[PDB]
Design a protein around this ligand. Structure first.
Ligand code: NA
Length: 156
């Protein structure tokens, strides 16, 4: 069996648009994603998600709602990524670009799937329908899915 490391992913989903962030630097730059990163010792998963949202997008929110969980496995990496996915309840500030991340709004008929992680084409439609989900994706490198599962659930 494998070990897993905890990560968060936050989607700022409004009725007609979604905020995504483009990774600006380093390996893996050039794709759009939600905001997030590793959970730190002691903080709850939700508080880690709020923290990463503020660091990467500038937005400060009091509460999130958990919508999904996605496990990622990469060929050659024994550690799994256990990603807890949240959506914002409400926002009340503007997103800010950093040297690491550029936030941008997309209309919900212009979701930039071809420039997102390949897995997002599978679970993001569920998120848009306000459904909850569990997913698993095995990748060869950054682009190729070798195996995956996706299931709508009633409780995350
Ligand atoms: Na991050």
């Amino acid at each position: 069996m494998k070990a897993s490391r905890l990560y968060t992913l936050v989607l700022v989903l409004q009725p007609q648009r979604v905020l995504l962030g483009m990774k600006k630097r380093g390996f893996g730059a050039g794709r759009w994603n939600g905001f997030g990163g590793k959970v730190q010792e002691g903080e709850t998963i939700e508080d880690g998600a709020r923290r990463e949202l503020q660091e990467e997008s500038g937005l400060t929110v009091d509460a999130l709602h958990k919508v999904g969980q996605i496990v990622f496995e990469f060929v050659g990496e024994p550690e799994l990524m256990d990603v807890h996915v949240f959506c914002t309840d409400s926002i009340q500030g503007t997103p800010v670009e950093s040297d690491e991340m550029r936030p941008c709004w997309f209309q919900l008929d212009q979701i930039p799937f071809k420039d997102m992680w390949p897995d997002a084409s599978y679970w993001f439609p569920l998120l848009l329908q306000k459904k909850k989900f569990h997913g698993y994706f095995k990748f060869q490198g950054q682009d190729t899915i070798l195996d995956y599962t996706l299931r709508e659930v009633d409780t995350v």
